[PDB]
Design a binder for this molecule. Structure first.
Ligand SMILES: Nc1ncnc2c1ncn2[C@@H]1O[C@H](COP(=O)(O)OP(=O)(O)O)[C@@H](O)[C@H]1O
Lengths: 199, 322, 109, 250, 322, 250, 322
């Protein structure tokens, strides 16, 4: 609601000023975190576009090499598909760090036709980097959304609440001072009247 | 009009007004209050259960403050006289149910319902603070709910009534099924308050499904049970059979939705709030429109039968859903 | 223990990737690849794709652009990051930057 | 038109009698000459501040923010000189115009005026800065005699239901705006988008109005219905099904 | 010094200084505003147009609060007297244009430019609130723009003027085209302010060509129209004819660029802000250099002719490009 | 030095008349003996307390926050006995010292002192706890008339540029510390590391002085240039090239 | 009882009590402080060092306020007499070390320790504000530490002592190495205060190794050097040799661990706080148990030797790590 419901007082005013400053500092730090995450996110986005463009060439070259291979070796697709056995290239999970956010990434690891093998190995070398980039991209997107939500929540709910509480506390302390002034003025008037009575 | 022995008789035949409007002499306001209560006491001694509506005791307190200022008395909090609390307590103490005086054994009452008008809507007001230390029931009204036209604007969180334990004896024998419904409704509202405090900062993305059901049934209770348009033929008066039937239906829906969600959390066919809402749009609208039943145009028997039919529809729809 | 790579594409793309050294048969002999022949329909592609995602050791998933368009709804539903899905070109259809399930998240492109 | 003018440079204490004079005249024109008198008291904040000055000079018991403890009674003496009267075909309609200090509707002047008067028309700075005229925020506004001035007979029979539903949908739209400020566009459900569209079209088609445009009550109700038709019937929970069936489809 | 009749006189030949520091008698400080406005009224009654400038009405209000405290008067809002608003309103009400009293038909005026000091930039204190409620113009100088070296430092976003509707007649008589130019310039600046956030969200590359035109003409107005150096001999004083000419040329460039972009959106050879800049760097340079016309040496006729020639060149270039 | 000592347990009316004795002596020495006097008035909060005591003795009602209503005039009377005068070669600079109660810059004593004076030198509790002496925070502190006190023939050509660049680099260093606290040391760029290094060496060499280390303003500027030579010439954007070409080398 | 010249003697033999309960007459409550300080001054003049404890100067200020009200004097802020500061100064300033009157040369002292207790721990309480302008030492209260049950609850961030400069001469002759230890301890505590805000606002993952050393050494110092349970036989009174030895060990560990982490930074064999903690959990445990040394049975020589052995173990373990 509008106010924290701390009873007006100088101690309460000090507590609310401290809380407001702490909230502002936390908002600024989370905004810097969001800025770092967004910078890395846009860098990874540009890298993703560039890697997709480069794939546009690597995959095409590999496919044309496949056509050239089939020109000589014949219908080698059936044997290659049937003779699968065990994977010779595998993926190992790795961690990366951006601000406090952990990004998952991947490691490429090893467990005419020769040219085709080389070209598709190069294609896999490119696509593993692409997969790592896209995984980091999704993680950064989620983390950026969460942190922006935190910053917006702070600066649109918590800080206004504390500001309203501080304004109310200041007004109520002004009221206390006004009441004390009225009582003291009344006492002074009564003392003057009593002095006149004695005189 | 009200029906006595099958004959309609006006309610002005039992109402007595003691009017002292805002621009009428200030010093009279105090007298007004006193006159009011005395009249009430007079009709309490006959054996009648009088009810005294003090339209605004804040105005009486303000009149006392003006007269004190003219007397150059030393003020209490916010200018009010030092005897404001004593005056309010002595006025409110005249309310209790009594065994009237005199030889014929009787039993009267004077229910004092005293509206307070805190300046600036701040309940820290000396008049409001002094009143809450005397009155046993506190129907605190919220300005935000009024602005949304959520009338009656009673703030269900801060308001309280210290007569519930004294009334369970009567509820258990006349509305035996009502006390647990009331307890569950208050639990739902408190849980919704906590979940709203969380959601305002975090959003509904991370809410547990049962938390979503709590939020949605709490919204149902707020919009379609608590709030009651008092200027309509159906919601001007809500008999207690209606007040308990509507709550029974909403709490039954809450129970069934929670049962489904909890018992199908482990299964693959996870029932969530969205599935219920899509399947039970008609039933949810019927629960929302339960308030529109007319106590007079539609008899008590018809209203009770329709609520029972809505309960049957809810049961059948949930069974067909699970 | 390490993750694998999965392929959903034409016989030629599958052959090239296998020559890359991506395929293997698991303990149940299940494969990590599929050849989308004309005898295979949309439901089969969606089912095998779902199997690939639910499997915990898959890691990367590669899908041809046109195949990805065919099962696009499943691609969009998949929102978690770890099962990295990549849309790749084909001789049948070219690759275009637009309408990629991952690039939906970017408006600065 | 009869004007009583007490400009900024004119005596301060005289403002304590400027309303009464006017009201007295209105009373003569209403309860003796049977006129229908619209009384407009401009800058009741100035009258209240003059009253505060006099009370401070007299050292009378102050209320909130230094105003006299009887400012409610005095503002009531001013305001309560309105309404019709038995056996006399005249009336006095009061529309005091008062400036809320610091836009604080809880300030003693606006607060006591709302306690006394039978409603209030709340001119909003947020709407004015957006250049919406009249910048009337209906949400904090109120009319206590609307409940009986509308219905079947006078105006139309959907007036109350349409007004209540517009209030509910406007409040929910403002709530959706508040939540969207935090959770962003992408987290709003379709109902939240419906409410935001209603809020936009309501502030653009219902509130917004030409300075010389005289909409009849029926035109206002038709605009209200065209706005309410954004939602499905089931989302209009204030309006009973009897009214919705007759007025919604068109 | 000021140049009158071709001679450099001292502005003290026509200026008076009611100067007093903070250790002077509090009554001297509190009556400084009244002495100044009474001298200004005296010189208005003589038929002259006076310009009173209160250096800081906040200090006068502090003196008023001090006098109130000395008199032991009830403290109003935040300690200020019970009449601060009345005093400020009655002081500012003395400003205005009058048909001077007396036989020789005259007309004088007093323009009050009283400055105020908001605590820490907060316009919510009683003095600043009352002044902003009373005054009709607010020139909103900003230290932020001063640091950016944008002189004058009028923030041109919080500033405002409520005399536009009063000056509509004067503009339509003498400067017919000024009003639409000013409205367009203000809307351009508002659009630039709104697009500053979109630039953060999606960068500049994601902006439409119309948005790029808006940004790159808003920059032109900020840096080459609003920004003005008071030390240079050419634009220390900018006659209104020169100002309206510059704004006319800027808004003409904006409108014709927008027209080109919109009317080439349908073609495959769509125009872009980059295309327009590459083709008309010379025109943009001339727009930036319009400032450098000396009102004294380059008479009104010469400056108007040069601006018309500039407009002719922009029209030729746009016609060739389009 | 002419030293006036009013102990805490000495009469408080003596506290009232102490600053007036001091400033009368300063006026005699400056405007009659023609020597540039510096008046250091310690703990003006204690003087305000004595003023409050005398006001209560007069039986006057407390003003804002319990202090006299005329405290602004009294503080102005004290402070404004300062400055250069026409036709006399002496002057009176003033350095009032205040104990901000509760570290509240809104308190009447510091508030009115800022209203009357022309700057502020902030002694920071954070720097004090970090054991830096003098714990003078340079970000919130300010000297309105610094520009009149520096430049060729007064201090040196490069005083203003060095001061501006030092302030800018200090602010950027604090910002970079805040950023490093969130991103981590590795994520920082080379310029961020340079700014952190400048911050550390500025708080260790410029601010940290020692009680008996007297630095001539030329020594202060030499230290400032030693700290500015952490960055290359290009990052010193607030120092005109005409000054960098002369003072940056070595 | 206390050990003097090898005998246990009652504390009453050198103690006097001026008992004044809260219900005793307020005038006596006002004169109690003066009687106590007069007795303390009398025994100071003898050549003794009298330590005086004022159980509450806040209750003394309440007595002054009540008597002022009874006298009908105008109060200062919060109702206290405007001479409260003067009375507090007249009381406190009677403390000090003095060359006592009388011919036989002697030097006595009166050390006043005045207890304050503002309403609700208010730091702006007029009695506390008047106290802070007089007292040279102030052992402020951390409500958070008190709630956590961290005793003594001194809040080391606003509590201060102005006698460090005067005590430099004593320390540089008796405890030469203590001053840098105190400086580093204060720096470490302030660094932890600055780092905890960030650790709780954002997260603990981004901390550098040196920040981890600072945080964990601050935890060590706070929990096992600044935390002293006064009810135990070993921690009822901690001799200053024990204090300085403990602080020397903690700061030596701090410096050496920071040296390790910094030197191995930018190197292949990097050292991190986790490595140090895992390697020498025994060293950390011994540093933690250092507080358990009991001077009564573990003589000064024994405690010093044990702390030297701990330092030797620390150095050996870091040499092995390096
Ligand atoms: N039960 C209700 N049903 C419908 N409207 C209500 C109800 N209670 C209050 N209201 C509305 O609230 C407004 C204020 O009513 P009232 O109680 O007279 O004001 P106050 O709070 O000053 O007493 C009325 O105009 C009325 O329309």
């Amino acid at each position: 609601k509008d106010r924290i419901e701390i009873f007006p007082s100088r101690m309460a005013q000090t507590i609310m000023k401290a809380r407001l400053k702490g909230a502002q500092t936390g908002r600024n730090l989370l905004k810097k975190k969001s800025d770092a995450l967004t910078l890395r996110f846009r860098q990874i986005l540009k890298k993703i576009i560039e890697t997709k463009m480069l794939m546009g060439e690597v995959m095409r070259e590999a496919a044309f090499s496949l056509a050239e291979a089939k020109f000589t070796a014949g219908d080698f697709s059936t044997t290659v598909i049937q003779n699968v056995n065990k994977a010779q290239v595998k993926i190992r999970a790795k961690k990366d760090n951006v601000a406090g956010v952990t990004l998952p990434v991947f490691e490429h690891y090893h467990e005419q036709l020769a040219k085709l093998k080389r070209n598709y190995a190069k294609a896999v070398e490119l696509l593993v980097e692409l997969a790592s980039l896209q995984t980091s991209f999704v993680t950064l997107d989620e983390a950026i959304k969460i942190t922006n939500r935190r910053v917006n929540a702070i600066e649109h709910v918590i800080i206004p609440r504390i500001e309203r509480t501080l304004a109310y506390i200041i007004t109520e302390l002004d009221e206390r001072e006004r009441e004390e002034f009225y009582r003291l003025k009344k006492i002074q008037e009564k003392k003057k009247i009593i002095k006149e009575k004695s005189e | 009009t009200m029906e006595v022995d099958g004959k309609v008789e006006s309610i002005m035949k039992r109402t007595a007004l003691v009017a002292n409007t805002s621009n009428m002499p200030v010093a009279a306001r105090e007298a007004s209050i006193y006159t009011g209560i005395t009249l009430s006491e007079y009709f309490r001694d006959m054996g009648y259960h009088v009810s005294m509506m003090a339209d605004s005791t804040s105005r009486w307190a303000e009149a006392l403050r003006e007269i004190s200022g003219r007397l150059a008395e030393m003020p209490a909090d916010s200018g009010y006289p030092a005897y404001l609390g004593a005056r309010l307590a002595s006025f409110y103490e005249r309310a209790g149910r009594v065994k009237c005086l005199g030889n014929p054994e009787r039993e009267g009452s004077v229910s004092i319902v005293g509206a307070v008008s805190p300046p600036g809507g701040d309940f820290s007001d000396p008049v409001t603070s002094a009143t809450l230390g005397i009155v046993q029931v506190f129907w605190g009204l919220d300005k935000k709910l009024a602005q949304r036209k959520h009338f009656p604007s009673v703030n269900w969180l801060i308001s309280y009534s210290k007569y519930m334990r004294a009334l369970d004896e009567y509820y258990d024998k006349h509305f035996t099924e009502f006390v647990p419904l009331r307890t569950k409704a208050k639990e739902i509202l408190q849980e919704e308050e906590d979940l709203a405090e969380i959601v305002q900062l975090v959003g509904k993305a991370s809410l547990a499904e049962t938390d979503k059901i709590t939020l949605e049934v709490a919204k149902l209770i707020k919009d379609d049970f608590l709030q009651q348009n008092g200027y309509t033929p159906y919601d001007r008066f809500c008999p207690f059979y209606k007040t308990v039937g509507m709550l029974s239906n909403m709490i039954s829906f809450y129970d069934m939705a929670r049962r489904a969600v909890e018992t199908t959390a482990q299964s693959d066919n996870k029932i969530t709030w969205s599935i219920i809402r899509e399947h039970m749009g008609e039933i949810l609208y019927k629960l929302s429109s339960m308030k529109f039943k007319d106590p007079v145009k539609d008899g008590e028997a018809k209203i009770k039968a329709d609520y029972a039919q809505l309960l049957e529809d809810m049961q059948n729809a949930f069974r067909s859903l699970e | 223990r390490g993750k694998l790579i999965a392929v959903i594409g034409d016989e030629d793309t599958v052959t090239g990737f296998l020559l890359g050294g991506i395929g293997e048969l698991n303990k149940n002999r299940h494969p990590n690849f599929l050849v989308v022949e004309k005898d295979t329909t949309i439901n089969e592609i969606e089912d095998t794709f779902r199997q690939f995602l639910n499997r915990d050791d898959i890691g990367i998933i590669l899908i041809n652009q046109y195949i990805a368009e065919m099962v696009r709804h499943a691609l969009d539903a998949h929102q978690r990051s770890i099962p990295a899905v990549l849309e790749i070109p084909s001789k049948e259809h070219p690759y275009d930057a637009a309408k990629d399930s991952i690039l939906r998240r970017a408006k600065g492109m | 038109v009869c004007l009583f003018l007490n400009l900024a440079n004119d005596p301060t204490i005289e403002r304590i009698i400027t309303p009464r004079l006017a009201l007295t005249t209105a009373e003569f024109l209403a309860y003796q000459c049977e006129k229908h008198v619209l009384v407009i008291l401009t800058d009741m904040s100035s009258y209240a501040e003059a009253l505060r000055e006099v009370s401070a000079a007299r050292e009378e018991v102050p209320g909130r923010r230094g105003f006299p403890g009887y400012m409610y009674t005095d503002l009531a003496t001013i305001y309560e000189r309105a309404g019709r009267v038995e056996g006399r075909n005249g009336s006095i309609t009061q529309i005091p115009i008062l400036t809320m200090p610091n836009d604080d509707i809880t300030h003693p002047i606006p607060d006591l005026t709302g306690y006394i008067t039978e409603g209030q028309i709340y001119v909003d700075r947020q709407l004015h800065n957006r250049q919406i005229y009249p910048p009337i925020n209906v949400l904090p506004s109120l009319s206590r005699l609307m409940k009986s001035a509308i219905g079947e007979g006078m105006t139309r029979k959907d007036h109350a239901d349409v007004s209540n539903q517009l209030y509910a949908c406007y409040a929910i739209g403002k709530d959706v705006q508040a939540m969207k400020a935090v959770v962003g566009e992408e987290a709003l459900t379709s109902d939240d988008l419906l409410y935001l569209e209603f809020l936009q079209k309501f502030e653009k088609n219902f509130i917004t109005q030409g300075p010389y445009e005289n909409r009849t009550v029926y035109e206002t109700l038709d605009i209200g219905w065209q706005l309410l038709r954004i939602f499905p019937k089931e989302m209009l929970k204030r309006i009973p099904q009897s009214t919705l069936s007759e007025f919604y489809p068109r």
